[PDB]
Amino acid sequence: EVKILVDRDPIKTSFEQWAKPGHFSRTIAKGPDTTTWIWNLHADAHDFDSHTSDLEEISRKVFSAHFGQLSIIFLWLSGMYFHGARFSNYEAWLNDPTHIKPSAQVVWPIVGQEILNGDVGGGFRGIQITSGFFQIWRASGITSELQLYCTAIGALVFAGLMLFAGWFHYHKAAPKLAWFQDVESMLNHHLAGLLGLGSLSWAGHQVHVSLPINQFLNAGVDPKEIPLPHEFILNRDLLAQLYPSFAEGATPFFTLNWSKYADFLTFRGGLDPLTGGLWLTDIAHHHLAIAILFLIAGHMYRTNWGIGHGIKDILEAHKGPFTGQGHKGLYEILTTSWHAQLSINLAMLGSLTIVVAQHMYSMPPYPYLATDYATQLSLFTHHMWIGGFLIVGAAAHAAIFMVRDYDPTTRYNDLLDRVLRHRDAIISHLNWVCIFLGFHSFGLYIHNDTMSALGRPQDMFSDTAIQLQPVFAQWIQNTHALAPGTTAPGATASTSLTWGGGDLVAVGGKVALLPIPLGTADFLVHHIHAFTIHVTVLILLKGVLFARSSRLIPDKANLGFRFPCDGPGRGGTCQVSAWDHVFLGLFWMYNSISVVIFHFSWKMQSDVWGTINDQGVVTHITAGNFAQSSITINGWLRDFLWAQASQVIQSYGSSLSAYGLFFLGAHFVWAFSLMFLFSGRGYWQELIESIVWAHNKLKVAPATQPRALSIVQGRAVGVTHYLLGGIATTWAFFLARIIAVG
Amino acid sequence: TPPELDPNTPSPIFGGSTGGLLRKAQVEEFYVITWDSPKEQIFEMPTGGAAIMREGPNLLKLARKEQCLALGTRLRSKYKIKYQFYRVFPNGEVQYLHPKDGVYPEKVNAGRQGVGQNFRSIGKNVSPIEVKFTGKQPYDL
Amino acid sequence: YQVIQPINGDPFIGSLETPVTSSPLIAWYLSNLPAYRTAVSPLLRGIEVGLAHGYLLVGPFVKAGPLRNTEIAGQAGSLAAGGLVVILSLCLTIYGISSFNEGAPSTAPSLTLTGRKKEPDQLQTADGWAKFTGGFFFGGISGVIWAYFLLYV
Amino acid sequence: SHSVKIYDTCIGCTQCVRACPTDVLEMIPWGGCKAKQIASAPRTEDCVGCKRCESACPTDFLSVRVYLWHETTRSMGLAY
Amino acid sequence: SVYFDLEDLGNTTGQWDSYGSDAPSPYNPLQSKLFETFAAPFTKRGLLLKFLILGGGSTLAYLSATASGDILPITRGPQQPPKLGPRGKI
Amino acid sequence: INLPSLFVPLVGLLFPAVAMASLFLHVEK
Amino acid sequence: GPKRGAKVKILRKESYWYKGTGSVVAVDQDPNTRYPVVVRFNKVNYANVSTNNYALDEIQEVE
Amino acid sequence: MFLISWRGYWQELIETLAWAHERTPLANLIRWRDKPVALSIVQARLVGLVHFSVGYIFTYAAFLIASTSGKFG
Ligand code: CLA
Numbered sequence A: 001e002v003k004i005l006v007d008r009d010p011i012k013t014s015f016e017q018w019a020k021p022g023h024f025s026r027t028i029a030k031g032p033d034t035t036t037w038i039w040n041l042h043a044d045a046h047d048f049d050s051h052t053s054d055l056e057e058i059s060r061k062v063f064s065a066h067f068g069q070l071s072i073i074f075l076w077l078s079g080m081y082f083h084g085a086r087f088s089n090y091e092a093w094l095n096d097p098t099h100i101k102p103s104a105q106v107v108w109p110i111v112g113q114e115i116l117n118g119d120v121g122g123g124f125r126g127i128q129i130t131s132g133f134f135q136i137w138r139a140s141g142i143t144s145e146l147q148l149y150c151t152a153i154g155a156l157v158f159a160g161l162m163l164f165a166g167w168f169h170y171h172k173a174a175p176k177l178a179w180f181q182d183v184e185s186m187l188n189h190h191l192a193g194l195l196g197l198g199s200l201s202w203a204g205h206q207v208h209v210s211l212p213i214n215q216f217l218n219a220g221v222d223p224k225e226i227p228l229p230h231e232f233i234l235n236r237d238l239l240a241q242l243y244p245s246f247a248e249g250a251t252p253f254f255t256l257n258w259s260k261y262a263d264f265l266t267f268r269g270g271l272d273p274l275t276g277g278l279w280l281t282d283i284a285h286h287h288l289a290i291a292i293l294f295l296i297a298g299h300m301y302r303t304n305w306g307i308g309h310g311i312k313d314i315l316e317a318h319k320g321p322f323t324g325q326g327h328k329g330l331y332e333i334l335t336t337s338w339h340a341q342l343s344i345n346l347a348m349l350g351s352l353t354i355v356v357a358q359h360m361y362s363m364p365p366y367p368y369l370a371t372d373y374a375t376q377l378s379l380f381t382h383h384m385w386i387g388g389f390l391i392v393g394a395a396a397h398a399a400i401f402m403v404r405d406y407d408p409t410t411r412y413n414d415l416l417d418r419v420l421r422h423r424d425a426i427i428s429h430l431n432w433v434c435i436f437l438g439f440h441s442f443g444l445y446i447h448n449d450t451m452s453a454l455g456r457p458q459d460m461f462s463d464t465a466i467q468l469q470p471v472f473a474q475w476i477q478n479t480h481a482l483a484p485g486t487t488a489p490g491a492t493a494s495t496s497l498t499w500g501g502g503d504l505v506a507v508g509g510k511v512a513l514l515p516i517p518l519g520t521a522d523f524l525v526h527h528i529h530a531f532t533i534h535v536t537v538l539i540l541l542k543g544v545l546f547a548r549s550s551r552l553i554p555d556k557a558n559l560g561f562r563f564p565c566d567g568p569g570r571g572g573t574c575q576v577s578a579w580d581h582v583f584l585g586l587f588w589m590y591n592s593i594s595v596v597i598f599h600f601s602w603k604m605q606s607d608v609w610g611t612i613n614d615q616g617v618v619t620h621i622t623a624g625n626f627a628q629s630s631i632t633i634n635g636w637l638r639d640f641l642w643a644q645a646s647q648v649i650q651s652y653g654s655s656l657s658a659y660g661l662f663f664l665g666a667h668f669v670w671a672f673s674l675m676f677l678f679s680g681r682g683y684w685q686e687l688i689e690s691i692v693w694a695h696n697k698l699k700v701a702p703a704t705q706p707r708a709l710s711i712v713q714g715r716a717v718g719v720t721h722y723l724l725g726g727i728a729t730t731w732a733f734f735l736a737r738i739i740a741v742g
Numbered sequence B: 001t002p003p004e005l006d007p008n009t010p011s012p013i014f015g016g017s018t019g020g021l022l023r024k025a026q027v028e029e030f031y032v033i034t035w036d037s038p039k040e041q042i043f044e045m046p047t048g049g050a051a052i053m054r055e056g057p058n059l060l061k062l063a064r065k066e067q068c069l070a071l072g073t074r075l076r077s078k079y080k081i082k083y084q085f086y087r088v089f090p091n092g093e094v095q096y097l098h099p100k101d102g103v104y105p106e107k108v109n110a111g112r113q114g115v116g117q118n119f120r121s122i123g124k125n126v127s128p129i130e131v132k133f134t135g136k137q138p139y140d141l
Numbered sequence C: 001y002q003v004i005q006p007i008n009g010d011p012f013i014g015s016l017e018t019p020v021t022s023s024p025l026i027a028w029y030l031s032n033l034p035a036y037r038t039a040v041s042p043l044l045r046g047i048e049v050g051l052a053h054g055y056l057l058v059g060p061f062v063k064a065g066p067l068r069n070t071e072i073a074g075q076a077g078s079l080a081a082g083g084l085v086v087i088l089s090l091c092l093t094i095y096g097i098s099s100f101n102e103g104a105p106s107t108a109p110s111l112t113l114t115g116r117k118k119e120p121d122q123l124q125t126a127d128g129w130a131k132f133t134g135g136f137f138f139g140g141i142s143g144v145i146w147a148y149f150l151l152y153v
Numbered sequence D: 001s002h003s004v005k006i007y008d009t010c011i012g013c014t015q016c017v018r019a020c021p022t023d024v025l026e027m028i029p030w031g032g033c034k035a036k037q038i039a040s041a042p043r044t045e046d047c048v049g050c051k052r053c054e055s056a057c058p059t060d061f062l063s064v065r066v067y068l069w070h071e072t073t074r075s076m077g078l079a080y
Numbered sequence E: 001s002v003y004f005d006l007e008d009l010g011n012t013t014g015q016w017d018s019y020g021s022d023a024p025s026p027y028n029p030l031q032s033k034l035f036e037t038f039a040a041p042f043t044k045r046g047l048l049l050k051f052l053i054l055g056g057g058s059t060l061a062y063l064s065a066t067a068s069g070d071i072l073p074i075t076r077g078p079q080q081p082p083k084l085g086p087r088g089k090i
Numbered sequence F: 001i002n003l004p005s006l007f008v009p010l011v012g013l014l015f016p017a018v019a020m021a022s023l024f025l026h027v028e029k
Numbered sequence G: 001g002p003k004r005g006a007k008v009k010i011l012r013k014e015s016y017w018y019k020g021t022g023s024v025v026a027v028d029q030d031p032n033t034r035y036p037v038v039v040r041f042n043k044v045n046y047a048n049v050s051t052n053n054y055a056l057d058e059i060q061e062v063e
Numbered sequence H: 001m002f003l004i005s006w007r008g009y010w011q012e013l014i015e016t017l018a019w020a021h022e023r024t025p026l027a028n029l030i031r032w033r034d035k036p037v038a039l040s041i042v043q044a045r046l047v048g049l050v051h052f053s054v055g056y057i058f059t060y061a062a063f064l065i066a067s068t069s070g071k072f073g
């Protein structure tokens, strides 16, 4: 019987706990004897499992926490809209999107930083933004700064509401555990109410506000001269002038004469030639269909009426000869353990962010986006990074479940057990396939470097020597290019210009998109991707599968999820914990994503982006050198890194100088991590002994005894500074490069 | 007191895994742990996976002594059950290992002679130069 | 019915019995390989193994080697294959010298799946391994020569 | 094998013995401390050298000490 | 229904021959005699080692010392006139 | 160029083979 | 020996509080006790311990 | 690599590889005489430092000689 369950006033609201650091932990609440205390206070702050054993209290904590997060995000959006209204060149940009650089940040004039306010156009001086907000705002039909202001106020209000909701649902009316456990209902409401009504109502805004205003903008009429959005709702005559379907109102909808609505609900595909973005009509139709799909999907699970599936039933129905009991027991696991859920959701959300990156490069959804190379590069890189991080997190919390929540005596599952019983085979096979992949991908590169160095280019792996064609990908390309004529008749063009066949979409003299050629170089990089991903998976999966025990450490589970080791014995057992596997997996994720974004950058600058001359002459940014240059490590070293770092290294004395500063700073932080990664806390402790002596000599030794960081924190600081450094380096490199030569 | 005898008692219910014995058991040595369970019940295997201990006598062969003391520790701590374990050589010989004198080493028991006990504080160890060119270590004195 | 069972019924031996490991087709296949002819002279086994391996070895050397696009492709590739045959024979030889003492008996299993006693493979002895290596060299070179003949004569 | 030594600063809290994962240490009668007992290491052939015992010892300085020495298949924690 | 036996430590520790067959020689008798007589010299591991090392080195030295210029560019040598160094140096 | 064609493969292939085999047998004994 | 609550200097070289001062808690009168002098310190050691046993020749009453 | 990742990870990995070898037919016929284990902690530090130093020296040597002799001042 699914219903609203809530406890009234579980926790009194008082600043008393604010004045007592570490209140959540009986150990930390006692106070500091050494400095280590401090770090612990922050490390275990959000580890609610180590706070209480009660699943209910934890669930409440996470719920209000989520409200806090949403509040923060609303405040963030509020900031973006407000800065877009008060400190930007957005209207000017609307007047001329093809020759004005998007800027929504200005700096104050002190210590010379005024130079950062550069000539972005529109009679405005500031920092060029690469978030892509301007194209969103144009797509939403926003024309004035006033509307941006109003959206900012709305977002601020929503921030207040989310914060209050957090306080309310923690201190005043806190849901019961059964409420959180109503997964059938939660799934129904999230499928139908969130996504369904979300894309439905959004389709509403698109059909009533986006389409008309954008039609006007594309027509060329001055934005101020364009009718306000509410008028298109009040006066249906305007929409009728733009799309005659509205003359018949909602009649063809109910009478099933949907063909009449082909004016604003299309299925053309490809890109709009005068904007370089997907057709907004296609987008509106897309959101309508999606809305229907999710709406019907949200009626799958049984709640307070007979109809509907039971999750446990569907799970217990799937069991084979190879797997025995199958998915039985998983419902209980996934309705009592937050870490399992977090694992699944992190893996899938990360993967989703990755697919978002790819789909947004290859099918530009916003007007004047494809030709804003800075924005595209930025979006791709950003979402790729977010994805990778979320995935590593999925590994972490999978392992955390494996150590803290797994209990085969009370919550047994056959699949998990069987996985555990042949983990050696799984990990060994992953190992082998990783070595094979490494050899047969990187080894090709080294082979090429050697042959090239020895004066034997005819012995290389390339398109002009020993060819390794991506036949399968080429076939998929051709198939997807010929699809509109055969297997998708209702579609006018392809879903993306990047497919093997097609024309070329250009906007304002710049290339928006064109068919992307795939050769030996692409085979090579793709197999590098497969390799790096496989290694990352090797590390993480090994980490979670051996989190509880191994032949080396039979009782590793009792040591916890996060611990440095089990001593120098057994030959040495450093980094045996699953946490340390998350730690190594982070480095490998960094590696993989780095080579991925380099792949994207070089390929785009070489074979896609660039200017287009009259009669159809396309001049790319790096003139198609990829196919010949990316086949050796030296090519990446010289033609990519060395050649393209030019913009960042000579950005001094201009508006892009901050990128030079960040280039150097990031290199510095990266190197700085190596001190932590390469060393150990014993040395630091003894050094600290000497320094402490010096402080005692002058009566200035603190009561909170100065301690070297723990082994684990040394590792965490190490990997954190390593990632921050490397990623920020590629950040500065990318942005300076693409902003200067774009 | 005489050590426990080692007969052929039934093994726990388990579908088999890849974490069991290897060639070391055949050529060098393996181990055997026995216990007496009040009922049929699930326990986690030291080598990974879940097994079912039967009621009465149970005998499990493992690859390392550490696995044996691990499992035994989990038995005594979780299931409140006494355990023993032995080492087994390829020739067939069995060596009784734990608990050595019938009493757990945590609690004192008369009869045990000291091994490796230095009757001096740790700081009073001689410098390495004192033992140069000898076979002795400063902690062997 | 279930598909995966403990190895030979023993759930505490570090392996599992799957269709890949133990099914009639694969079992018959492996048991008929020269390596598992546990009751025959290791010399003949060596001849077969070396023959097959040298024969396959001729392929990739000829087509992928540095002289693949020259009139002297077959000679070069086959020679290289013979070279690898020699090197691998050297490897096998030192493996035999290092692993088995002339006095030491067979280290091969002396039991079957059923549990009955049988004569240990003489492949796991010094003399036996030496014979196997001789067979790998003879058969290796012979296989290279034969493949080269079929390919270019 | 590794070497394990007990020193007379031992106060017989037995923490090290119940910390060993391979049953190396044990408690024997003694008169040097109030607890009437001292630690002992009769089975260092099974010692892996993890040093959990040292991490369990309360005394300053340690009354149990592990000197990693000759390396064997048992001390390497190998199961193969 | 047990798997522990002191008298039979072989079955206890899974020391089985999983795929070894007790079948007699399936090979060609004439070819068997051929190989048993002709491949015999290489069945002495010391002599085989000496023969493979010395013979292999000898062969390598042969094909190396007599390598044609049409095979190895290193034996053919330079065929174009030399270029002058950066600072007018030979 | 005459001698190098003899000595180079001698030191680069034969010598390390002999040495590695010898050291292998020595260390394995 | 020294009285209870007496401020003593540590003479044991391998002690965390070597050359430092602590307070006497109790002295074991059993002559078989090798380290009777129970001492407590203001700061904990690397093992989070604030108390330790010493011998008569390992403490020095000062003020 | 040798400086950042430490022993236990590799030791366990190698354990799974040892299992892999003892359970792979044909390859089963070949067995090691010295048990495969992960490098020791100190050994790891040394090997890591060695790769680091060699890389350092060789890289800077190549740059030095190439940049200088490429133009000869
Ligand atoms: C994440 C969102 C975000 C970010 C990164 C920024 C960033 C910026 N804003 Mg923007 N802003 C935002 C949201 C954001 N804003 C929102 C939602 C609004 C609407 C209210 C604004 C309205 C706004 C205006 C009107 C201006 C800016 C300006 C700026 C710039 C200078 C900031 C400054 O120096 O403040 C001033 C610095 C301080 C106030 C420092 C005091 C910090 C105190 C001492 C900390 C005390 C700790 C304590 C716990 C915090 C208070 C808690 C409180 C509950 C009591 C900087 C780029 C300026 C600008 O861009 O000029 C060209 C500017 O004029 N912002």
Ligand code: CLA
Binding pocket: A011, A012, A013, A014, A015, A016, A017, A018, A019, A023, A024, A060, A061, A062, A064, A065, A067, A068, A163, A164, A165, A166, A167, A170
């Ligand atoms: C506004 C009045 C108010 C007061 C007096 C309290 C008081 C309390 N809360 Mg409650 N709560 C409130 C509002 C309030 N809350 C709101 C608005 C929410 C929704 C977020 C919650 C949700 C909530 C949860 C889930 C929990 C509490 C808990 C508590 C108790 C301990 C918390 C504590 O002392 O740490 C004080 C914490 C801080 C001073 C840090 C604030 C952290 C902010 C909000 C995060 C955002 C910072 C952001 C990242 C900026 C970083 C910038 C840059 C440096 C990176 C204490 C009685 C805890 C409890 O009862 O334990 C048994 C507990 O688990 N509260």
Ligand code: CLA
Binding pocket: A042, A043, A044, A045, A046, A047, A048, A342, A346, A389, A390, A391, A392, A393, A394, A396, A400, A561, A562, A579, A582, A583, A720
């Ligand atoms: C889906 C979101 C999400 C949520 C809710 C959690 C929640 C949790 N994680 Mg998980 N995790 C996630 C994603 C998430 N994680 C991701 C994406 C990764 C990959 C990096 C991980 C990898 C991971 C590890 C390895 C561990 C956790 C742990 C935890 C638990 C304790 C967290 C804590 O208290 O730290 C307090 C929060 C901090 C100390 C924040 C500081 C983090 C760095 C310093 C900030 C980075 C700098 C920033 C980018 C820029 C700085 C600019 C300037 C300030 C210099 C908590 C349940 C821990 C645990 O024990 O679980 C039981 C744990 O050991 N997580």
Ligand code: CLA
Binding pocket: A439, A440, A441, A442, A443, A444, A446, A447, A450, A459, A460, C060, C061, C064, C065, C066, C067
């Ligand atoms: C690791 C990737 C890789 C690959 C695929 C190649 C491939 C090649 N190299 Mg290159 N090389 C590499 C890395 C690689 N190299 C690196 C990193 C360097 C720097 C040290 C070099 C330096 C180099 C030089 C100096 C030369 C080559 C040459 C060659 C060519 C001939 C090689 C040869 O004769 O071997 C023989 C090939 C084999 C023995 C094949 C064995 C593998 C088989 C397929 C295994 C089959 C297993 C089976 C599928 C499993 C199931 C069994 C079941 C069916 C029964 C060949 C195209 C030569 C050339 O001129 O190229 C044009 C040459 O002169 N390489």
Ligand code: CLA
Binding pocket: F003, F004, F005, F007, F008, F010, F011, F012
């Ligand atoms: C000791 C320093 C030294 C070094 C670094 C070199 C280096 C070289 N020699 Mg030269 N060589 C040397 C001394 C040295 N030589 C001396 C003193 C003689 C007179 C006997 C020669 C006679 C010689 C000839 C005829 C040729 C070379 C050639 C070469 C080149 C190829 C390597 C080779 O095959 O030589 C082989 C070297 C020898 C046969 C003589 C060395 C014998 C000494 C007495 C023992 C050395 C043992 C050594 C220290 C052990 C190190 C390994 C150990 C640590 C494991 C290489 C640049 C070849 C060449 O120039 O190609 C372009 C070539 O054809 N060398």
Ligand code: CLA
Binding pocket: C065, C066, C067, C076, C077, C079, C080, C082, C083, C086, C087, E052, E053, E055, E056, E057, E059, E060, E063, E064, E071, E072, F008, F009, F011, F012, F013, F014, F015, F017
């Ligand atoms: C440092 C010493 C050294 C020397 C002198 C050589 C010499 C050679 N290598 Mg290289 N190689 C070396 C080290 C060396 N290698 C190392 C360290 C690596 C790994 C980085 C390689 C990786 C490599 C690859 C992948 C390839 C070579 C190849 C070659 C041959 C050049 C291609 C050619 O056109 O020749 C012409 C070659 C022939 C016409 C066929 C050669 C047949 C030989 C001479 C028969 C010898 C038989 C005899 C039993 C050898 C036993 C020696 C042993 C007992 C010591 C040439 C013989 C190529 C090759 O072997 O082509 C077949 C080739 O593909 N090498």
Ligand SMILES: CC1=C(/C=C/C(C)=C/C=C/C(C)=C/C=C/C=C(C)/C=C/C=C(C)/C=C/C2=C(C)CCCC2(C)C)C(C)(C)CCC1
Binding pocket: A077, A078, A151, A152, A153, A154, A155, A158, A197, A200, A201
């Ligand atoms: C951007 C942004 C924002 C804003 C937002 C908005 C503005 C929203 C809106 C929203 C909306 C405005 C929504 C709406 C919705 C509606 C709906 C969802 C409706 C539905 C309906 C229906 C579904 C119907 C049905 C029916 C039919 C069809 C017939 C029969 C009867 C009935 C009636 C049942 C904020 C500030 C937050 C923040 C910042 C960002």
Ligand SMILES: CC1=C(C/C=C(\C)CCC[C@H](C)CCC[C@H](C)CCCC(C)C)C(=O)c2ccccc2C1=O
Binding pocket: A675, A676, A677, A679, A680, A681, A684, A707, A708, A709, A710, A711, A713, A714, A715
């Ligand atoms: C450098 C380094 C340290 C030393 C780093 C330390 C001790 C970090 C602490 C440094 C800060 C600056 C001390 C905290 C400062 C206080 C907050 C006081 C602030 C004073 C104001 C002026 C800001 C380790 O402890 C360590 C441990 C394990 C592996 C590697 C390493 C390692 O590489």
Ligand SMILES: CC1=C(C/C=C(\C)CCC[C@H](C)CCC[C@H](C)CCCC(C)C)C(=O)c2ccccc2C1=O
Binding pocket: H001, H002, H003, H005, H006, H007, H008, H010, H011, H037, H038, H039, H040, H041, H044
């Ligand atoms: C990769 C890695 C391994 C795995 C590496 C292994 C097992 C070494 C394998 C090397 C192979 C066998 C040979 C490699 C080729 C060498 C060039 C051989 C040189 C031999 C000299 C005598 C010349 C560890 O064991 C390890 C241990 C502790 C900390 C870090 C690490 C670590 O990072």
Ligand code: SF4
Binding pocket: A564, A565, A566, A567, A568, A572, A573, A574, A575, A680, A711, H006, H041
């Ligand atoms: S982590 Fe530090 S302490 Fe723990 S084992 Fe590795 S080295 Fe020894």
Ligand code: SF4
Binding pocket: A569, D002, D004, D019, D020, D021, D022, D023, D024, D025, D046, D047, D048, D049, D050, D051, D052, D053, D054, D066
């Ligand atoms: S080191 Fe580990 S194993 Fe050796 S004795 Fe101390 S605790 Fe027992």
Ligand code: SF4
Binding pocket: D006, D009, D010, D011, D012, D013, D014, D015, D016, D017, D038, D039, D053, D056, D057, D058, D059, D062, D063, D064
């Ligand atoms: S821990 Fe230190 S003190 Fe306690 S018993 Fe073992 S040795 Fe004696």
